[PDB]
Design a protein around this ligand. Structure first.
Ligand SMILES: CC(=O)Nc1c(F)cc(C(=O)N[C@H]2CC[C@H](O)CC2)cc1O[C@@H](C)c1ccccc1
Length: 112
């Protein structure tokens, strides 16, 4: 159906975001932010709903997402967390912006 087809487009986007093509700026988003490892002892006080591409991949594989909108909400939550926690001129924010550009332009090519 339409939902299955739209979720296949989402899975295609997810595969691209995890691909070597985008690795130079995607890598901070591959796994959950390790707040303790990075010394970010305020991270989980500021970010109430952590999200990352490994979590999106697990949710896609487990058929957690019922539609494209639900998938997109998690990918955008991941970027929003980065923009909320970090100063806007930090390298990780520049990398978030670049990966979100990849995401938004391909998400816009969703089949109707
Ligand atoms: C997905 C994400 O956003 N991760 C992530 C993060 F939440 C915060 C910081 C970080 O160090 N923020 C600083 C902002 C200014 C404060 O005064 C000191 C903390 C770094 C992060 O990624 C590491 C791997 C990174 C490190 C360097 C370049 C790219 C990614």
């Amino acid at each position: 159906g339409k939902l299955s087809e739209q979720l296949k487009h989402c899975n295609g986007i997810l595969k691209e975001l995890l691909s070597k093509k985008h690795a130079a700026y995607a890598w901070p988003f591959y796994k959950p932010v390790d707040a303790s490892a990075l010394g970010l002892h305020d991270y989980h006080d500021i970010i109430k709903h952590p999200m990352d591409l490994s979590t999106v991949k697990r949710k896609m594989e487990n058929r957690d997402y019922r539609d494209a909108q639900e998938f997109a909400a998690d990918v955008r939550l991941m970027f929003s967390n980065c923009y909320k926690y970090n100063p806007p001129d930090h390298d990780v924010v520049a990398m978030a912006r670049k990966l979100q550009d990849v995401f938004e332009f391909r998400y816009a090519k969703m089949p109707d």
